[PDB]
Design a protein around this ligand. Structure first.
Ligand SMILES: Nc1ncnc2c1ncn2[C@@H]1O[C@H](COP(=O)(O)OP(=O)(O)O)[C@@H](O)[C@H]1O
Ligand code: ALF
Ligand SMILES: [Mg+2]
Length: 439
DNA sequence: GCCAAGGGGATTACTCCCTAG
DNA sequence: CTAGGGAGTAATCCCCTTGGC
């Protein structure tokens, strides 16, 4: 391993470094599709550290990541390779306008004496600042959570496709997503000459370009997830709403509006129309009634717990209930500013006092480590099993020591069931499409 | 002057059904 | 007669104008 590293790569990660090095030295690009929590970051960083250590390329190295991952990757690269001067390219336009003063355009290869070596950037900024970005030449590009790039009609695909870069990685734990075209977009991006626009063939052609190990094999020290399915019925208020709403199917089947209204009442009828008493507010949502009994048991267990919502208005209502109860919580959603994210995550991870993290599906589902929680609760299931898997794999990562449990509140006899059954069967489709070897 | 808010808008996600190849 | 791409909607996040001390 490159001597720049602070902490030793594990056996499978060293094999992963070797694959990434061979991809580079053979002049080709590939996807590190290693499962969640296997340590894609240390392998990818060790590539950059090898380009530095072996070929004296001290960048310019680009990291693109989701906004909640940015502080995590800045910290971890500082941990694993302190020699790399990070440029944390995020901020307001005026703050970014100052940070551009560190971009040396004269050197196409930076040396250790350089204003920066690794630049870490949001998927948002490579698009908004694209006009600045495409005027620079990158010696290696890493893309975290490459499922962000899965749509070829997305501006972030079109923009990053056109970046002048020698070699590129896609990092993901969930490559397949919804369709073969979404897989192609990841394959075209890495190797545009080969993949310009049956499973026996697929697993043969992709073998050089994707590497994927799984926790069942390499990380079996961590116990399996305990998934639990927690059915509850529509309380009398909810079914009065749901049935009078379903009466619109005397005309329809607007249906795409109705399925969002049906999801709202399955979360809490106050989302549809607010009432009043907090005792009624608990019992007039069946999910919240079953959750209250569950949190009551989990607290006596000492089970620090992550609650995932598909709605923002629900995570508001949720902390009204958490302030009616005695429960100490913290919160993270797509509106919390990035320094607020860093501090809340670090706060939760530091002090065991906090019981609940009210955590968003998307903004709270990727990149970050939450190993001091042990329980994950989906208040809402999601249409994409990869997203719910990403959310639940925030615990159950290489730092975990407690057993992990995953609960899922499903309102029986509602579209909450169709959503979960449709998302669940896609996991089998995605598993079948990964029937071949990933090694 | 300095911080706050939020509010607006463009991008991205994913189902459902129209319409044309 | 199938598929493509438009309609709906809500989360995500940068910009920026208003307001207060
Ligand atoms: N060789 C290693 N030594 C120590 N810690 C590691 C190693 N590899 C991974 N980790 C730890 O694994 C945790 C999660 O890994 P990470 O790479 O963030 O997962 P992902 O593959 O989703 O990015 C991190 O806290 C990181 O410190
Ligand atoms: F694949 Al990750 F945090 F980067 F689960
Ligand atoms: Mg990662």
């Amino acid at each position: 391993q490159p001597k720049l590293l602070n902490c030793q790569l594990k056996e499978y990660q060293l094999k992963g470094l070797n694959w990434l090095v061979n991809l580079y030295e053979q002049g080709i690009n590939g996807i590190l599709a290693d499962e969640m929590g296997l340590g894609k970051t240390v392998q990818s960083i060790s590539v950059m550290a090898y380009l530095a250590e072996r070929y004296d390329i001290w960048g310019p190295f680009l990291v693109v990541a989701p906004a909640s991952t940015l502080h995590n990757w800045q910290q971890e690269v500082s941990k694993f390779v302190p020699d790399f001067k990070v440029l944390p390219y995020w901020g307001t336009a005026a703050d970014r306008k100052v940070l551009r003063k560190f971009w040396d355009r004269k050197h196409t290869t930076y040396k250790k004496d350089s204003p920066f070596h690794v630049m870490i950037t949001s998927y948002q900024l490579v698009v908004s600042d694209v006009a600045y970005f495409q005027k620079m030449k990158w010696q290696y590009m890493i893309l975290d959570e490459a499922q962000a790039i899965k749509s070829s009609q997305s501006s972030r695909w079109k923009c990053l496709l056109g970046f002048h870069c020698r070699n590129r990685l896609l990092l993901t734990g969930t490559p397949i997503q919804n369709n073969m075209q979404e897989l192609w977009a990841l394959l075209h991006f890495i190797m545009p000459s080969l993949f310009d626009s049956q499973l026996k063939r697929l697993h043969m052609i992709l073998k050089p370009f994707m590497l994927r190990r799984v926790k069942k094999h390499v990380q079996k020290e961590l116990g399996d997830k305990i998934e639990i399915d927690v059915f509850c019925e529509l309380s009398y208020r909810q079914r009065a709403m749901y049935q009078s709403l379903r009466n619109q199917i005397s005309i329809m089947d607007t249906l795409m509006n109705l399925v969002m209204q049906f999801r709202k009442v399955c979360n809490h009828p106050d989302l549809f129309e607010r009432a009043p008493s907090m005792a009624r507010f608990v019992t007039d949502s069946g999910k919240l009634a079953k959750l209250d009994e569950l949190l009551r048991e989990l607290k006596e267990g000492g089970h620090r717990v992550l609650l995932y919502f598909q709605m923002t208005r629900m995570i508001d209502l949720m902390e009204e209930y958490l302030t009616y109860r005695n429960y100490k919580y913290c919160r993270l959603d797509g509106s919390t500013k990035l320094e607020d994210r860093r501090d809340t995550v670090a706060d939760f991870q530091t002090r065991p006092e906090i019981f609940i993290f009210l955590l968003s599906t998307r903004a709270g589902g990727l990149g970050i480590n939450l190993t001091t929680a042990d329980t994950v609760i989906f208040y809402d299931s999601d249409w994409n099993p990869t997203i719910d898997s990403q959310a639940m794999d925030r615990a159950h990562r290489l730092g975990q020591t407690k057993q992990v449990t995953v609960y899922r509140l499903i309102t029986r006899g509602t579209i909450e069931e169709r959503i979960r059954k449709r998302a669940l069967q896609k996991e089998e489709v995605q598993r079948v499409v990964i029937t071949g070897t990933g090694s």
